């Protein structure tokens, strides 16, 4: 039989292992020849595997690279202008890779050039609340200072935006052992921890879903009109550079000024974690100098797009996509995901060769330039937005398959919750101590839902990955799954975006039997299989009703911290709860009809109502000042692009509202967002009513 | 048989006559009790007629009314402040209506209040080119002057916007006999011309598709957040009032200053048509004073929505909509259209009672507050935008059925051209001298296409009516048809928006046998019938390809008036012509497939490609500073809301470009619009490619 079981059984751990090794021998940095060559290899193999069509879709987008002959570094300088300490120019390469060419040295992609010199301020994680603490409580002024921040907690682009708004003239990012060195584990190559010379690369843009900085709204094709750099979206205005903790210790150890305000500001280095500004008495005339000479350059990038045409609904697309570009070797990020995609394509193709086809079209994507701001997926979705809008059933992401070996992690739209529960009950757990048990059982035991007994935790979609354009801009039901660590005995994984993130890292420490990779291939591949083949789309609208009520309770509880203002300005959540109540009623009735209808028009009408339900949460006017975040229920947090926020329009209107100098105007805007949200929830509900 | 012929034969001229009489006995001004009562009558009758459901959809929107106890008027005042001449407070009512209550006196809806006093400047039609002529050629400064403009040529809202941008402190609008009095015809009640005491009512907003001024983007429902008046969309900032030509003559006769620049500035009154400023020597100390006391008030409005559920595709909507609110009696505008809609509903219902149903759902609408800015249709489309976006096949408008008795006038998307040709070849001409001939033959003879022998003229959609939200905002294929005058022996019709526009006007002078009304009911009703019942949607994509090439030629020819700048800034139309060429190729191939496929999924897939083709021309970012005009091929002209402009983004970027003080920036923006247009044409084309 050609059924999900056939598809699943054909997936092999050893294949995924072979593909991961194959993809991680040399760096595949976006816009380089090596990553174009990998694209052509993947294109060829997907054709060999049996896909109907496999094309490259290329764009010319703004990328950023260090200058090979003018290296980036940071100094402590003395009064005579002698640079008495310099940060490293590269990470010591790991065993056996010491002769590998083209390893990009650590840098912050899209930093402007500059050589600012000044006094340091330490800002903890550079989060919104860290700057509140500095400015409001500690009375420390960052204006004209170089800020040093530890990586962790939030997306590094938000840190830079926060430092810029505080008036900083530069930012130094560093990896603190508190956040990147698990106690009792050895650093690479002897364990999975970050060595003192290791450094996290990464872009520092604030694109808010725009895609290529020069072409917001439109694909960066051969005739595209480009904004001038001064009008580009999301570039930082101050120099930024990342360092490791050996180098950070040399920068922090001399810090004077104010003590850290409390223990949450202290990392693990043997330094006082003084906030500054500047150095203690004897060193008070020394300064910090950055030297950044990276350049932004419009560069060609290549997505691979594979199509497996549907037998019955070829105009309905289920998309499995993940990136291919990496900072260096991409042992975890993204090649552990890309190897799983490759095996999934291979398995679907085996079935296709035996005469099978999925009901709906499956599209497979290898995205480029994800690490530079989700550029490849976003340009392609801009090019194809009309097809995606009217035909996109779902998008399943496929970045890093593992960040740990403890349990599953799933983030998805509520419309997929029931699909994911059902699938994981039919998969075997690969966990020690759960042999013969389902993945659902092990996952539920290791990661219980905070709200329901006997259910697992499933998180909201945030961002920082290639689903953002499909979900938050276009309103296509989206999901992701991977294996993760125990968050209660441990900040991602330590070697993230370092030269040390290699094939050996995965093979030796994360997943030597490739059983977690295989489990992840079964979950992603199985979701795609069900989405593409189920007669009725496997979305349960009733799960959206439950979460909408949870999010309405949550946003109301935030507002209710301000009872006097709610009285004064007549701020009511009645309309939103009314909309949520109606959504619950209409969804329940729709579910009954879905169960209770041989009629393919009624089916397809009902599948269309299912497919367009996520779409109904899109507001074509976008959220305030973020026109590419159009989904009214979910947006990336304005304080941390990685985290999802629910009812983001209302959340941001209420955020720090007590500090707004015109409360009438601020509360007016809260009420406006309540209206927009109530209206959108009711409008989405009405898409599930009888159509005439 | 239940076929189009049965539907058509059931339509009766005498019914349409009865309904028109019934709808025009008293005024039905938006937001008044009489128009709520008419809504309830129509709702009841549509139910009686056999529709499946008939509901009222109400909204609370900003309307504008004169103050009953503080009348609007205009004076000439002398130096002592004595008002030596006052304009009329009302139009002399026509025979038999002298005791009719609740006739709103002439006013410009949404005028702010004020009593400005100053010197007059005559500005011809107050068009963009008229103000160019004043300011650039004649060196006449309108700043601080009251401007007087004749109605005609362009939408009166554009006149007011133009006068405001010229610095005018007030506007007087008047009906010149040149534009409202056909030579050799008597004025009402003895003929169809405008009497000297007649006055044209009408709103003067510049909404650019926003709908209710206080709620752009969202329906004005019971919990809606409203903008404060100062942030409202589209309100004028200077007082405006309309007068008739008896009163205009008294204002114009004393005018001094500069002679009119040429004969195109002279109307038909016995006055010199001097431009001013101010009066000739003896009267030079007299001024003009306006007194405007109208108020804007949020007011409830009611649309009637009738549903005739489709038998096979109930989730596909064909909409027949037209307004019900009138300035006074609405003898032509809108009740000649509304009576035709009523008869169309009656006929469809007769068939429904015999067991027939259309393939697709037909929705019938009686829109409210059209005369105050398309408010009823726009709020309802804002409320239902998700349903309309994903399910709207077409929108057929149904305002005034007659503006003359000469020939047909059709304005529609190119996707309907072939539908309209085919239908009109199957209808009888009602014209004298064409008995036994088709409507196509008479229409083609009387109104030949400017480009093709043996074809009739079909115009682009402009705006100023209830299709605007469906077509320019939402991208639903739209059309309209009516009977019109011979534009070559004659500015709409003379009695437009006057108390004299009555049932008797129509019955005595326009259409005594109601045969033109009947023809129009056959065309509108027949279009709806074919759209709702044809197995394959009756849209020919190839007709869009032909017009796109015409519009590309046209916009290129405008640019080519500036060869030096095109060289300097490297401005190429290559990408747009390439996109148009591709559209032509892909449409041709799609047409072959459409002809060449028992498979209802392929059919519906193909019908979806047909339905979403108009949709593909929508850009979700809108046109510059006009976010509700989203269609990239067609928008209302920025100089005249009534006229459609093709490639409006490029057109506006090129408009008066030689007067821009930064040519590099201006030509940059031309190139940007070329890119947006090329991309959108190519993207629309690709929706017609094989789907996988
Ligand atoms: C959740 O779903 C429910 C439906 O189960 C929706 O209920 C609607 O709520 C609105 C707003 O509260 C009601 O609006 C009211 O409508 C009255 C007229 O309704 C009649 O006519 C319409 C159309 O003809 C029919 O649909 C309806 O069946 C009735 O026959 C108005 O008269 C009301 O206005 C008056 O009172 C208000 C409030 O005090 C005053 O402000 C006004 O000035 C005026 O005096 C009012 O507008 C509507 O009737 C309800 N529909 C129902 C029950 O079917 C909820 O709106 C929905 N939630 C959300 C968030 O959308
Ligand atoms: C109307 O429809 C036609 C198709 O019939 C489209 O034609 C495309 O035109 C674009 C832009 O001109 C071509 O873009 C070029 O692609 C080359 C690579 O193409 C190959 O690879 C892709 C994917 O792998 C395949 O789709 C394709 O079949 C080829 O195998 C690039 O190398 C070109 O860039 C180089 O030259 C340019 C121009 O001198 C330089 O600026 C660059 O720096 C670089 O050196 C270029 O990008 C594309 O190949 C065409 N597709 C075809 C013929 O199938 C039109 O674009 C379309 N019109 C519009 C408005 O969309
Ligand atoms: O330009 C961009 O937008 C991104 C480019 C690039 N993307 P790339 O480097 O390819 O991928 C980074 C994705 C990090 C993200 N973190 C998160 O989602 C962590 C967010 C965090 N949640 C969690 O940490 C979390 C952990 C365990 C669990 F069971 C559930 C949740 C939170 O909600 O606060 C994740 O793990 O999915 C980059 O981040 O540099
Ligand atoms: O607020 C609004 O937007 C409109 C409210 C209200 N709408 P309401 O009062 O209900 O309806 C007014 C519609 C006038 C429009 N003129 C036009 O389309 C004339 C535009 C004109 N074309 C023509 O005059 C024309 C004539 C004959 C023919 F065979 C083809 C075209 C042009 O292109 O320059 C028409 O005839 O369709 C109003 O105009 O006051
Ligand atoms: C996840 O798995 C569950 C459990 O199998 C699925 O729910 C089940 O769905 C089936 C199929 O529609 C329901 O069967 C129906 O039962 C009713 C009578 O109770 C009858 O009217 C129908 O003819 C049919 O036999 C079943 O009740 C339902 N079980 C539940 C809700 O507990 C669920 O659909 C799956 N989720 C997916 C696929 O997203
Ligand atoms: C308007 O009326 C015209 C004339 O009837 C319609 O065009 C005609 O459409 C029919 C139906 O598809 C075409 O018939 C086909 O002919 C080809 C062989 O030539 C064959 O492959 C098919 O099996 C079928 O018999 C016909 O050719 C075509 N005539 C033309 C283009 O001159 C047109 O579709 C109508 N427009 C509408 C309904 O919007
Ligand atoms: C990248 O940097 C190179 C080299 O920079 C030089 O060496 C550095 C260590 C430092 O001393 C710089 O100031 C030096 O210029 C740049 O190449 C130079 O460009 C200038 C013209 O701007 C030229 O006169 C120099 O001779 C070049 N020097 C060398 C060694 O080639 C180059 O511009 C930078 N690449 C970029 C910005 O993309
Ligand atoms: C820290 O580095 C500076 C600069 O060194 C140069 O740039 C580095 C990135 C690396 O590529 C070096 O090889 C380059 O020479 C050192 O200061 C320079 O020292 C040289 C030779 O002594 C002198 O002629 C230059 O003028 C200096 N440049 C500057 C900008 O001062 C410095 O010695 C290093 N400090 C330490 C402690 O190693
Ligand atoms: C509409 O106008 C009335 C009446 O206006 C009065 O009569 C005019 C001819 C002129 O002389 C005005 O200045 C007069 O006020 C308004 O009613 C008046 O409102 C004021 C309070 O603002 C009150 O003191 C007066 O007595 C009222 N006069 C009468 C006759 O009722 C009314 O405000 C206006 N309606 C609106 C603005 O909606
Ligand atoms: C033109 O009208 C003004 C004002 O008349 C008032 O408002 C009109 C709309 C109408 O409703 C009249 O009945 C009102 O009296 C006349 O000037 C007024 O004259 C009266 C009585 O003579 C005097 O007491 C007022 O103060 C005047 N008001 C003003 C504003 O001047 C004027 O006479 C009329 N001119 C002509 C030629 O008829
Ligand atoms: C990754 O695997 C691919 C596919 O097997 C290898 O590319 C092939 O290499 C052989 C030997 O050079 C060639 O004959 C084939 O033409 C290649 N096939 C392609 C490109 O599709 C590639 O060498 C492997 N890379 C590494 C680093 O092991
Ligand atoms: C317009 O026609 C309607 C429908 O016939 C008339 O309304 C009816 O009037 C009769 C007599 O008053 C009532 O018994 C019915 O209840 C009404 N039917 C409705 C409202 O659906 C209406 O009187 C006519 N108007 C004019 C001005 O002639
Ligand atoms: C911080 O520092 C600069 C002076 O160097 C000043 O201009 C700026 O306004 C200061 N801000 C605060 C809040 O003190
Ligand atoms: C793999 O799992 C084991 C067993 O719990 C654990 O001790 C080890 O830390 C895990 N490795 C990684 C990289 O998380
Ligand atoms: C028109 O008139 C006023 C002076 O009353 C002046 O301020 C304005 O700038 C003038 N404009 C031109 C173009 O002369
Ligand atoms: C009706 O048609 C006749 C015959 O051409 C014409 O003389 C008359 O002007 C027309 N009436 C109107 C209102 O256009
Ligand atoms: Ca772009
Ligand atoms: Ca609105
Ligand atoms: Cl992922
Ligand atoms: Cl019309
Ligand atoms: Zn990644
Ligand atoms: Zn990454
Ligand atoms: Zn009208
Ligand atoms: Zn009108």
PDB file of C-alpha atoms in Angstrom, chain A residues 541 544 548 579 582-584 586-587 590 609-610 612-618 631-633 676-689, chain B residues 383-387 391:
ATOM      1  CA  UNK A 541     -11.039  25.144  13.886  1.00  0.00           C
ATOM      2  CA  UNK A 544      -8.350  28.129  17.467  1.00  0.00           C
ATOM      3  CA  UNK A 548      -8.460  32.787  21.266  1.00  0.00           C
ATOM      4  CA  UNK A 579     -16.281  37.838  19.011  1.00  0.00           C
ATOM      5  CA  UNK A 582     -19.181  33.711  18.456  1.00  0.00           C
ATOM      6  CA  UNK A 583     -16.053  32.128  16.964  1.00  0.00           C
ATOM      7  CA  UNK A 584     -16.468  29.225  19.445  1.00  0.00           C
ATOM      8  CA  UNK A 586     -19.634  28.995  14.738  1.00  0.00           C
ATOM      9  CA  UNK A 587     -16.564  26.726  14.799  1.00  0.00           C
ATOM     10  CA  UNK A 590     -18.869  24.077  11.282  1.00  0.00           C
ATOM     11  CA  UNK A 609     -13.210  27.300   4.467  1.00  0.00           C
ATOM     12  CA  UNK A 610     -10.544  25.332   6.350  1.00  0.00           C
ATOM     13  CA  UNK A 612      -8.897  30.300   4.295  1.00  0.00           C
ATOM     14  CA  UNK A 613      -9.460  30.311   8.031  1.00  0.00           C
ATOM     15  CA  UNK A 614      -5.825  31.144   8.902  1.00  0.00           C
ATOM     16  CA  UNK A 615      -6.039  33.627   5.991  1.00  0.00           C
ATOM     17  CA  UNK A 616      -8.974  35.407   7.649  1.00  0.00           C
ATOM     18  CA  UNK A 617      -6.707  36.617  10.469  1.00  0.00           C
ATOM     19  CA  UNK A 618      -4.770  38.767   8.068  1.00  0.00           C
ATOM     20  CA  UNK A 631      -1.783  38.499  11.214  1.00  0.00           C
ATOM     21  CA  UNK A 632      -3.941  40.060  14.012  1.00  0.00           C
ATOM     22  CA  UNK A 633      -3.658  37.132  16.464  1.00  0.00           C
ATOM     23  CA  UNK A 676      -9.599  45.783  15.235  1.00  0.00           C
ATOM     24  CA  UNK A 677      -9.072  42.506  17.062  1.00  0.00           C
ATOM     25  CA  UNK A 678     -12.810  41.930  17.850  1.00  0.00           C
ATOM     26  CA  UNK A 679     -13.689  42.712  14.254  1.00  0.00           C
ATOM     27  CA  UNK A 680     -11.015  40.350  12.848  1.00  0.00           C
ATOM     28  CA  UNK A 681     -12.044  37.486  15.171  1.00  0.00           C
ATOM     29  CA  UNK A 682     -15.685  37.942  14.188  1.00  0.00           C
ATOM     30  CA  UNK A 683     -14.778  38.194  10.477  1.00  0.00           C
ATOM     31  CA  UNK A 684     -12.732  34.966  10.681  1.00  0.00           C
ATOM     32  CA  UNK A 685     -15.628  33.268  12.474  1.00  0.00           C
ATOM     33  CA  UNK A 686     -18.024  34.322   9.713  1.00  0.00           C
ATOM     34  CA  UNK A 687     -15.847  32.560   7.100  1.00  0.00           C
ATOM     35  CA  UNK A 688     -16.949  29.316   8.831  1.00  0.00           C
ATOM     36  CA  UNK A 689     -20.688  30.169   8.689  1.00  0.00           C
TER      37      UNK A 689
ATOM     38  CA  UNK B 383     -17.281  44.023   6.998  1.00  0.00           C
ATOM     39  CA  UNK B 384     -17.322  41.100   4.471  1.00  0.00           C
ATOM     40  CA  UNK B 385     -13.968  41.601   2.714  1.00  0.00           C
ATOM     41  CA  UNK B 386     -12.699  38.079   3.491  1.00  0.00           C
ATOM     42  CA  UNK B 387     -15.801  36.403   2.014  1.00  0.00           C
ATOM     43  CA  UNK B 391     -15.629  33.987  -3.151  1.00  0.00           C
TER      44      UNK B 391
END
